[PDB]
Design an enzyme around this catalytic site. Sequence first.
Site, PDB file in Angstrom:
ATOM      1  CD  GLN A  81      -3.783  -4.814   5.718  1.00  8.56           C
ATOM      2  OE1 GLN A  81      -3.736  -4.056   5.065  1.00  8.56           O
ATOM      3  NE2 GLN A  81      -4.420  -5.840   5.049  1.00  8.56           N
ATOM      4  CG  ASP A 129      -9.741  -1.233   3.353  1.00  7.08           C
ATOM      5  OD1 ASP A 129      -9.294  -1.795   2.314  1.00  7.08           O
ATOM      6  OD2 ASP A 129      -9.099  -0.993   4.369  1.00  7.08           O
ATOM      7  CE  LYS A 168      -3.790  -2.803   1.400  1.00 12.14           C
ATOM      8  NZ  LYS A 168      -4.267  -3.500   2.790  1.00 12.14           N
TER       9      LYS A 168
HETATM   10  C1  LIG Z   1      -7.229  -9.324   4.240  1.00  9.70           C
HETATM   11  C2  LIG Z   1      -7.014 -10.021   3.090  1.00  9.70           C
HETATM   12  C3  LIG Z   1      -7.373 -11.369   2.823  1.00  9.70           C
HETATM   13  N1  LIG Z   1      -8.089 -12.341   3.748  1.00  9.70           N
HETATM   14  C4  LIG Z   1      -8.220 -13.607   3.309  1.00  9.70           C
HETATM   15  C5  LIG Z   1      -9.079 -14.285   4.373  1.00  9.70           C
HETATM   16  N2  LIG Z   1     -10.317 -13.692   4.837  1.00  9.70           N
HETATM   17  C6  LIG Z   1     -11.094 -14.333   5.673  1.00  9.70           C
HETATM   18  C7  LIG Z   1     -10.167 -12.195   5.051  1.00  9.70           C
HETATM   19  C8  LIG Z   1      -9.532 -11.702   3.791  1.00  9.70           C
HETATM   20  C9  LIG Z   1      -6.984 -11.937   1.490  1.00  9.70           C
HETATM   21  C10 LIG Z   1      -6.304 -11.014   0.794  1.00  9.70           C
HETATM   22  C11 LIG Z   1      -5.903  -9.783   0.704  1.00  9.70           C
HETATM   23  C12 LIG Z   1      -5.094  -8.883  -0.061  1.00  9.70           C
HETATM   24  C13 LIG Z   1      -4.888  -7.633   0.243  1.00  9.70           C
HETATM   25  C14 LIG Z   1      -5.287  -7.177   1.697  1.00  9.70           C
HETATM   26  O1  LIG Z   1      -4.946  -6.235   1.940  1.00  9.70           O
HETATM   27  O2  LIG Z   1      -5.857  -8.043   2.709  1.00  9.70           O
HETATM   28  C15 LIG Z   1      -6.310  -9.318   2.102  1.00  9.70           C
HETATM   29  C16 LIG Z   1      -3.828  -6.823  -0.409  1.00  9.70           C
HETATM   30  N3  LIG Z   1      -3.422  -7.170  -1.537  1.00  9.70           N
HETATM   31  C17 LIG Z   1      -2.083  -6.890  -1.976  1.00  9.70           C
HETATM   32  O3  LIG Z   1      -1.480  -6.092  -1.230  1.00  9.70           O
HETATM   33  C18 LIG Z   1      -1.452  -7.618  -2.950  1.00  9.70           C
HETATM   34  C19 LIG Z   1      -1.700  -9.081  -2.974  1.00  9.70           C
HETATM   35  C20 LIG Z   1      -0.960  -9.909  -4.196  1.00  9.70           C
HETATM   36  C21 LIG Z   1      -0.051  -9.005  -5.138  1.00  9.70           C
HETATM   37  N4  LIG Z   1       0.156  -9.344  -6.022  1.00  9.70           N
HETATM   38  S1  LIG Z   1       0.130 -10.989  -6.780  1.00  9.70           S
HETATM   39  C22 LIG Z   1       1.087 -12.037  -5.314  1.00  9.70           C
HETATM   40  O4  LIG Z   1       0.383 -11.263  -8.157  1.00  9.70           O
HETATM   41  O5  LIG Z   1      -1.343 -11.415  -6.167  1.00  9.70           O
HETATM   42  C23 LIG Z   1      -0.123  -7.726  -5.115  1.00  9.70           C
HETATM   43 CL1  LIG Z   1       0.647  -6.846  -6.257  1.00  9.70          CL
HETATM   44  C24 LIG Z   1      -0.687  -7.060  -3.838  1.00  9.70           C
HETATM   45  C25 LIG Z   1      -4.369  -8.136  -2.143  1.00  9.70           C
HETATM   46  C26 LIG Z   1      -4.642  -9.336  -1.348  1.00  9.70           C
END
Ligand SMILES: Cc1c(N2CCN(C)CC2)ccc2c3c(c(=O)oc12)CN(C(=O)c1ccc(NS(C)(=O)=O)c(Cl)c1)CC3
Lengths: 293, 290
Positions: free
Chosen positions: B97, B120, B53
Amino acid sequence: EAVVISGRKLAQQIKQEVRQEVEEWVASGNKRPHLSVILVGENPASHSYVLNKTRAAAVVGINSETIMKPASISEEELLNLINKLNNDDNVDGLLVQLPLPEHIDERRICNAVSPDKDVDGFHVINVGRMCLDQYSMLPATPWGVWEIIKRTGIPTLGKNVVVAGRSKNVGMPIAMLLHTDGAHERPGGDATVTISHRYTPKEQLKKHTILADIVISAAGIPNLITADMIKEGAAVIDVGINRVHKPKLVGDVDFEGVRQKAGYITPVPGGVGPMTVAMLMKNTIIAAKKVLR
Amino acid sequence: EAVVISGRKLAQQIKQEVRQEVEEWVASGNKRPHLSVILVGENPASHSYVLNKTRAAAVVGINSETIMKPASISEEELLNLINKLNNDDNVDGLLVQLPLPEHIDERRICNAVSPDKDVDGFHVINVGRMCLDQYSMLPATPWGVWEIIKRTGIPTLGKNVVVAGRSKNVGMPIAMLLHTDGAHERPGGDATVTISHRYTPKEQLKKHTILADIVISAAGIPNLITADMIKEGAAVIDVGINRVPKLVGDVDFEGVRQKAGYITPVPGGVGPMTVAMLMKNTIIAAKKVL
Ligand SMILES: Cc1c(N2CCN(C)CC2)ccc2c3c(c(=O)oc12)CN(C(=O)c1ccc(NS(C)(=O)=O)c(Cl)c1)CC3
Ligand SMILES: NC(=O)c1ccc[n+]([C@@H]2O[C@H](COP(=O)([O-])OP(=O)(O)OC[C@H]3O[C@@H](n4cnc5c(N)ncnc54)[C@H](O)[C@@H]3O)[C@@H](O)[C@H]2O)c1
Ligand SMILES: NC(=O)c1ccc[n+]([C@@H]2O[C@H](COP(=O)([O-])OP(=O)(O)OC[C@H]3O[C@@H](n4cnc5c(N)ncnc54)[C@H](O)[C@@H]3O)[C@@H](O)[C@H]2O)c1
Ligand SMILES: Cc1c(N2CCN(C)CC2)ccc2c3c(c(=O)oc12)CN(C(=O)c1ccc(NS(C)(=O)=O)c(Cl)c1)CC3
């Protein structure tokens, strides 16, 4: 051939529950519940609906008053009324009959009503809460639809549902209730739901309804649903109320056709319509109990 | 064969847009947008996302400060933090977060962030507004998914969409955007949408997907979507992110890759879009448009 479902009968049962719960509440020495309705102008249909609601409050022992206003009223004034009512501790439920006149913004009126008195459940907070599966003042019509299904014992978990229509007041909330988790604060139906609307192709509707254990129509289109669309054994809930022409009233379902294929069906008239008014009485007793503070 | 869509390049395109929008905005004499991120505890994946972020913010000319806190923080404390940040007229966007630790009620938290700073889009008011097709701070992953679809040019009006997953942060918002009226204050995709989830039987899933011009998968299950589920020439959007190390989607990439008309990879797919759209939301917040 298909079990027809009386929403008239179902609705009277529900009103019996409410009547008892209100006698209980009052004999406990609490103030009798009071529902306030605001009715603007003279839509004939509007008038009829308010009357439905005030009769129903009468039969269940809920006090009501309709505060009626001329179509000529201004948005700002309407907010003033609503504000009086929100502040009147005697007023438990408050609802604004719709539709309102075009110089009045509905969304802002709906958001005017205090969420704790919002027995229509149209306030943005109640919408938010419902969409997060939290306890909320559920909207009467979708709640009624759900009650028909639940009380008829028709299962939903794992099953496929198709809703025709996606209005914020009917179609969308039905779809929301039925697809959501049974485990959440406000349980949903754990169904697999398809939302269709005015830009779904007819061939596409049919391609989906055909797979459906439950079809729920809220489009306002007569014979939108016909037996060739409907799987054998399916439940079909008719939310539509269309005026065909002496003038009568019909559903979006081909009643006569569909009852041949279907495992269950709801008539129009006498299905969802009266359930709506019943669930409104439920919301009023809930609001009087300040249970969802 | 199947066009792979670069989330990396589109995210980069959006970042460039925001960067420029921030330059103009600062050049007009306006305060530089500031994004605050709260991190609680030490979830590795969390730490990683928060960095993605603040890094994004730095490249687009937005100021960031992450406030990291002990897993052990009291809920009353965090709410106090949030209320401070809510009150600081120099913070434009605030975000917490997730997940929080077990003694913290996530819902009380999301609802504690000012709706106007809720980048968000998780505040109940932003959820409500979204669900009524009004203007709102849209959640970043769903908006990202939509942008991948618009920018790639895949049609939605009339078309059939299936979404796998129904979480309030991803699956449900995705379904909301895609089925709603293009004509509303916040336009939607006018598509026909099927929501599936953990109680949809494989059988049923498949009978729905094979009818879908767009399958969007946000379930968190490796290989949920296989080429026999899909229909020749169809857009497949993989929102999943599964730690098997290695990171994989919900979709079987090489498998689906042959039947799909379009496909998005994991990594390098939706994930980057999420970070982009959050920059979009921070500039919006800064402008106090809504
Ligand atoms: C709280 C949470 C998740 N939880 C899963 C279970 N569920 C119970 C709650 C949510 C699941 C996923 C996320 C994600 C984010 C977040 O901030 O919180 C999450 C923020 N993200 C990122 O910063 C990011 C991820 C992957 C990337 N590249 S890739 C490796 O090619 O995919 C890039 Cl560039 C950025 C997305 C994913
Ligand atoms: N039974 C009740 O108590 C009750 C309560 C409210 C509304 N209704 C009835 O339900 C119907 C819809 O009312 P509303 O206010 O929810 O809707 P509306 O008039 O605001 O919109 C109808 C919806 O149907 C959709 N639609 C239109 N044509 C369609 C088609 N061919 N296939 C699929 N969807 C299509 C539209 O996209 C729209 O979302 C009307 O008959 C109304 O009178 C009944
Ligand atoms: N790409 C991104 O930037 C981004 C952002 C957030 C989440 N995600 C990923 O999306 C996935 C979903 O996580 P989440 O937080 O949205 O939800 P979640 O983990 O809370 O739940 C997943 C959802 O999938 C549904 N589901 C479970 N089994 C299913 C099945 N067999 N068929 C269909 N649906 C099924 C569940 O009912 C639930 O709604 C995970 O892979 C997560 O990491 C990606
Ligand atoms: C604002 C509005 C509608 N609009 C239609 C256009 N759309 C653009 C907006 C919504 C559509 C329907 C309604 C309804 C009500 C309302 O209060 O408002 C509505 C309240 N209702 C009733 O009081 C009722 C109706 C029918 C009954 N009996 S029957 C003939 O057997 O069905 C019985 Cl017993 C009660 C339900 C319908």
